[PDB]
Design a protein around this motif. Structure first.
Motif, mmCIF file in Angstrom:
data_model
loop_
_atom_site.group_PDB
_atom_site.id
_atom_site.type_symbol
_atom_site.label_atom_id
_atom_site.label_comp_id
_atom_site.label_asym_id
_atom_site.label_seq_id
_atom_site.Cartn_x
_atom_site.Cartn_y
_atom_site.Cartn_z
ATOM 1 N N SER A 1 -3.131 16.664 -22.557
ATOM 2 C CA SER A 1 -3.677 16.005 -21.369
ATOM 3 C C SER A 1 -2.664 15.867 -20.237
ATOM 4 O O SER A 1 -3.006 15.296 -19.189
ATOM 5 N N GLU A 2 -1.450 16.404 -20.415
ATOM 6 C CA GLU A 2 -0.327 16.158 -19.502
ATOM 7 C C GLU A 2 -0.732 16.282 -18.036
ATOM 8 O O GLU A 2 -0.639 15.311 -17.266
ATOM 9 N N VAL A 3 -1.197 17.464 -17.629
ATOM 10 C CA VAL A 3 -1.431 17.696 -16.200
ATOM 11 C C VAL A 3 -2.550 16.805 -15.677
ATOM 12 O O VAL A 3 -2.418 16.193 -14.609
ATOM 13 N N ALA A 4 -3.662 16.712 -16.411
ATOM 14 C CA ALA A 4 -4.768 15.870 -15.953
ATOM 15 C C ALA A 4 -4.379 14.397 -15.928
ATOM 16 O O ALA A 4 -4.843 13.645 -15.065
ATOM 17 N N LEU B 1 2.454 9.357 -5.708
ATOM 18 C CA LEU B 1 3.194 10.605 -5.502
ATOM 19 C C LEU B 1 4.155 10.901 -6.642
ATOM 20 O O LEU B 1 4.351 12.073 -6.993
ATOM 21 N N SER B 2 4.790 9.865 -7.209
ATOM 22 C CA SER B 2 5.729 10.105 -8.300
ATOM 23 C C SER B 2 5.026 10.730 -9.491
ATOM 24 O O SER B 2 5.628 11.534 -10.210
ATOM 25 N N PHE B 3 3.749 10.390 -9.698
ATOM 26 C CA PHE B 3 2.981 10.982 -10.788
ATOM 27 C C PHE B 3 2.367 12.323 -10.386
ATOM 28 O O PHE B 3 2.320 13.253 -11.201
ATOM 29 N N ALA C 1 0.827 -1.202 0.000
ATOM 30 C CA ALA C 1 0.000 0.000 0.000
ATOM 31 C C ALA C 1 0.862 1.254 0.000
ATOM 32 O O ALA C 1 0.590 2.208 -0.739
ATOM 33 N N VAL C 2 1.910 1.274 0.824
ATOM 34 C CA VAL C 2 2.827 2.402 0.802
ATOM 35 C C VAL C 2 3.578 2.449 -0.526
ATOM 36 O O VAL C 2 3.778 3.527 -1.099
ATOM 37 N N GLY C 3 3.961 1.285 -1.055
ATOM 38 C CA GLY C 3 4.568 1.241 -2.379
ATOM 39 C C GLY C 3 3.698 1.885 -3.443
ATOM 40 O O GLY C 3 4.157 2.726 -4.223
ATOM 41 N N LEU C 4 2.420 1.519 -3.474
ATOM 42 C CA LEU C 4 1.510 2.147 -4.420
ATOM 43 C C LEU C 4 1.372 3.644 -4.157
ATOM 44 O O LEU C 4 1.195 4.424 -5.100
ATOM 45 N N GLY D 1 -2.048 9.681 -10.713
ATOM 46 C CA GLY D 1 -1.349 9.809 -9.444
ATOM 47 C C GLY D 1 -2.286 9.783 -8.246
ATOM 48 O O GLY D 1 -2.110 8.983 -7.319
ATOM 49 N N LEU D 2 -3.297 10.659 -8.241
ATOM 50 C CA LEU D 2 -4.266 10.640 -7.142
ATOM 51 C C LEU D 2 -4.952 9.281 -7.045
ATOM 52 O O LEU D 2 -5.113 8.732 -5.945
#
Ligand SMILES: CCCCCCC/C=C/CCCCCC(=O)OC[C@@H](O)CO
Ligand SMILES: CCCCCCC/C=C\CCCCCC(=O)OC[C@@H](O)CO
Ligand SMILES: CCCCCCC/C=C\CCCCCC(=O)OC[C@@H](O)CO
Ligand SMILES: CCCCCCC/C=C\CCCCCC(=O)OC[C@H](O)CO
Ligand SMILES: CCCCCCC/C=C\CCCCCC(=O)OC[C@H](O)CO
Ligand SMILES: CCCCCCC/C=C\CCCCCC(=O)OC[C@H](O)CO
Ligand SMILES: CCCCCCC/C=C\CCCCCC(=O)OC[C@H](O)CO
Ligand SMILES: CCCCCCC/C=C\CCCCCC(=O)OC[C@H](O)CO
Ligand SMILES: CCCCCCC/C=C\CCCCCC(=O)OC[C@H](O)CO
Ligand SMILES: CCCCCCC/C=C\CCCCCC(=O)OC[C@H](O)CO
Ligand SMILES: CCCCCCC/C=C\CCCCCC(=O)OC[C@H](O)CO
Ligand SMILES: CCCCCCC/C=C\CCCCCC(=O)OC[C@H](O)CO
Ligand SMILES: CCCCCCC/C=C\CCCCCC(=O)OC[C@H](O)CO
Ligand SMILES: CCCCCCC/C=C\CCCCCC(=O)OC[C@H](O)CO
Ligand code: NA
Length: 457
Positions: free
Chosen positions: A428-431, A351-353, A343-346, A437-438
């Motif tokens: 579409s980069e930011v979205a 966060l990386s995204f 879960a922390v890995g995911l 990521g979220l």
């Protein structure tokens, strides 16, 4: 006694065999997508860039799937040592095919060769490492860690060397360097093996019994006939574009684990407990595998890298693995449940995204941003990798068919990518980064909540 970092000397041969094979593979990975952009830009290859990205993902998906079969073919038919050898020859030919003076027409042959060759070689070099050690040799973990270090070393230097050659001397020269790397691996492997590997592994260790040949033949032939049947029906109804074939391979890659779950569940608590871990691994690997597709796109289009080859960013994944392993090795002896680790890995992957959503949100998407954004992105996703990857095999075995499902998790993740990466583009980069990521953080939090029950099961 003379050792290789405390291990039997055969490990040196296998370390270098894998190091040079991974050099060939990740040297190719670091330039293949740009090569397809180049073939597209000259009118030689008639696909969109999104399809090019999709190809990269399903290629990786098939390579992982192929590795699920190579152990069986060696153990039961040709032997582990010849599997690594002929597998390497096929890998080498796969790069030779792209070094030849062809264009788009050589891509499929190269991909098929590397899919088959890597499927023969990868499971079977790992098998041969195990054969260095007697049953209760406690060095076994240490030897495999050294082996994995060889893998990362090859992954690290190949984009540097092959990517620089590509920009200086052209794609054909660069792919020829990948073939030469594999050739080097074959030389060391062949001559080193005779001096250090048990000749027992020149032959299958569990050869098909007389009554097993025909059922195996029937089963393979039925699978090939079914697949070819699906492909003729696809062409009759007009589903014959390249994305249509990619969707077929996506479906196949996902169906295989889905049918295994249905098998085990209906034929119990531990297996049910594995569904969320397998899903978490799938989503982690999706994001991790996008480094070579989506982050490579971002690196070429949106990073100011005027003074260094943009393919070099692919070195950051293995670099961070190598840099992090001492700290994590110390942590696991100084110090969490495996569902919590997943879960922390995911969450780190998410966060990386999320991090990559910031430069476009803050500066716009029409300019260029600092390489350090990607450096931070890979820093975060690899942090998650250090949590999930060293335990993934363990958790799936703590809970033969299913043992392979751990390896399939990265094939499924890459198959998911074959669909998802077609959504990524300048507009579409930011979205894209925000949403996925979220979405990965939220599922990481869900898995946290479920972590206790799963711990019981
Ligand atoms: C324990 C693991 C440590 C890894 C954590 C790394 C987290 C990364 C955060 C992103 C920092 C990079 C973004 C800063 C940046 O882009 O600088 C741009 C500036 O230098 C150019 O004007
Ligand atoms: C129980 C969770 C299952 C895991 C499935 C992983 C997610 C699979 C598919 C999500 C695809 C829909 C994403 C499309 C999307 O909105 O992208 C946003 C961006 O491209 C533009 O806004
Ligand atoms: C070692 C344990 C780590 C625990 C971390 C817990 C979660 C950490 C940070 C959550 C941040 C997620 C916020 C995402 C966000 O604000 O994006 C908003 C944006 O998508 C709106 O369009
Ligand atoms: C241009 C004609 C090519 C014909 C192909 C036949 C190739 C036959 C032998 C090639 C020499 C390599 C064979 C050695 C081998 O089997 O490796 C397996 C084990 O690793 C042996 O230690
Ligand atoms: C053990 C699984 C074996 C599955 C074999 C089928 C997988 C074959 C290729 C992987 C997907 C690549 C399809 C796209 C492709 O080949 O590119 C070709 C060029 O784009 C020609 O337009
Ligand atoms: C069994 C030996 C296999 C060893 C690896 C094969 C690679 C050997 C030599 C590479 C020569 C290929 C040169 C590439 C090339 O032609 O560049 C073309 C340039 O774009 C212009 O000519
Ligand atoms: C997915 C397409 C690729 C299919 C390749 C798999 C080949 C399928 C069956 C091969 C049969 C294996 C050889 C038979 C054999 O060696 O018999 C010797 C026995 O060990 C003694 O009875
Ligand atoms: C391309 C996959 C479609 C299915 C074709 C693969 C079949 C290839 C070979 C099967 C031939 C039957 C093997 C029997 C055999 O040769 O064993 C001989 C025994 O070892 C006799 O001592
Ligand atoms: C095992 C025999 C079955 C037939 C060969 C297996 C290849 C499996 C899937 C093929 C998917 C790759 C398609 C490559 C390709 O170029 O298709 C694009 C079309 O030309 C678009 O019109
Ligand atoms: C272990 C079970 C393996 C199951 C594999 C089953 C594969 C069955 C059907 C796949 C056919 C779907 C591909 C056709 C397709 O999706 O077209 C894509 C686009 O809509 C065409 O423009
Ligand atoms: C063994 C460590 C050697 C030093 C790190 C190796 C670098 C390997 C790949 C770097 C990938 C490209 C990143 C570019 C970069 O980080 O530049 C950041 C600058 O500070 C921005 O101007
Ligand atoms: C639990 C491990 C987490 C590692 C924490 C280190 C990361 C700390 C902050 C990361 C946030 C990255 C954004 C930095 C930023 O936005 O600055 C942009 C500047 O405008 C660039 O000049
Ligand atoms: C512990 C260090 C973690 C560092 C990464 C922190 C990431 C947290 C939030 C980044 C999410 C930024 C979303 C940007 C965004 O979606 O804005 C949309 C704008 O309207 C631009 O279209
Ligand atoms: C502005 C952001 C809003 C604040 C979000 C931060 C919330 C951080 C963590 C919430 C996690 C909820 C804990 C539930 C939990 O861990 O259950 C305990 C058991 O060990 C779960 O199996
Ligand atoms: Na550059």
């Amino acid at each position: 006694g003379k050792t290789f970092f405390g291990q039997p000397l055969g490990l040196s041969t296998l370390f270098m065999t894998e190091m040079w094979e991974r050099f060939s593979y990740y040297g190719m990975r670091a330039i293949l997508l740009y090569y397809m952009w180049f073939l597209i830009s000259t009118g030689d290859l008639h696909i969109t860039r999104a399809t090019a990205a999709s190809i990269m993902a399903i290629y990786a998906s098939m390579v992982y799937l192929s590795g699920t079969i190579g152990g069986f073919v060696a153990d039961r038919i040709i032997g582990a040592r010849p599997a690594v050898f002929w597998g390497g020859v096929l890998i080498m030919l796969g790069h030779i095919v792209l070094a030849l003076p062809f264009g788009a027409s050589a891509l499929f042959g190269s991909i098929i060769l590397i899919i088959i060759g890597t499927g023969f070689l990868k499971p079977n070099v790992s098998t041969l490492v195990g054969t260095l050690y007697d049953e209760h040799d406690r060095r076994r973990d240490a030897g495999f860690s050294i082996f994995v270090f060889g893998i990362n070393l090859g992954a690290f230097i190949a984009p540097l060397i092959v990517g620089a050659a590509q920009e200086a001397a052209g794609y054909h020269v660069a792919f020829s360097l990948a073939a030469i790397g594999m050739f080097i691996g074959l030389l060391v492997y062949y001559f080193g093996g005779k001096k250090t590997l048990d000749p027992h592994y020149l032959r299958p260790t569990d050869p098909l019994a007389p009554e097993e040949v025909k059922p195996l033949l029937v089963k393979v032939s039925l699978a090939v006939a079914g697949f070819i049947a699906i492909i003729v029906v696809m062409n009759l109804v007009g589903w014959n574009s390249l994305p249509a074939y990619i969707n077929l391979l996506t479906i196949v890659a996902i169906a295989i684990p889905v049918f295994y779950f249905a098998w085990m569940i209906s034929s119990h608590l531990r297996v049910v407990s594995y569904i969320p871990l397998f899903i978490a691994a799938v989503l982690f690997w999706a994001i991790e595998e996008q480094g070579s597709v989506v982050l490579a796109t971002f690196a070429a289009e949106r990073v100011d890298s005027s003074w260094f080859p943009v393919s070099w960013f692919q070195s950051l994944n293995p670099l961070f693995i190598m840099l992090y392993t001492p700290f994590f090795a110390w942590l696991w002896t100084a110090w969490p449940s495996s569902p919590t680790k997943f879960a922390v890995g995911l969450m780190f992957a998410g966060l990386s995204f999320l991090l990559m959503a910031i430069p476009g949100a803050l500066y716009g998407t029409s300019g260029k941003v600092s390489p350090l954004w990607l450096v931070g992105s890979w820093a975060l996703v690899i942090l998650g990798e250090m949590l999930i990857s060293p335990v993934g095999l363990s958790v799936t075995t703590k809970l033969s068919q299913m043992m392979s499902m751990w390896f399939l998790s990265s094939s499924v993740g890459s198959a998911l990518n074959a669909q998802l990466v077609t959504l990524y583009n300048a507009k579409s980069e930011v979205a894209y980064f925000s949403y996925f990521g979220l979405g990965s953080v939220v599922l990481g939090i869900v898995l946290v909540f479920l972590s206790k029950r799963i711990q019981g099961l």
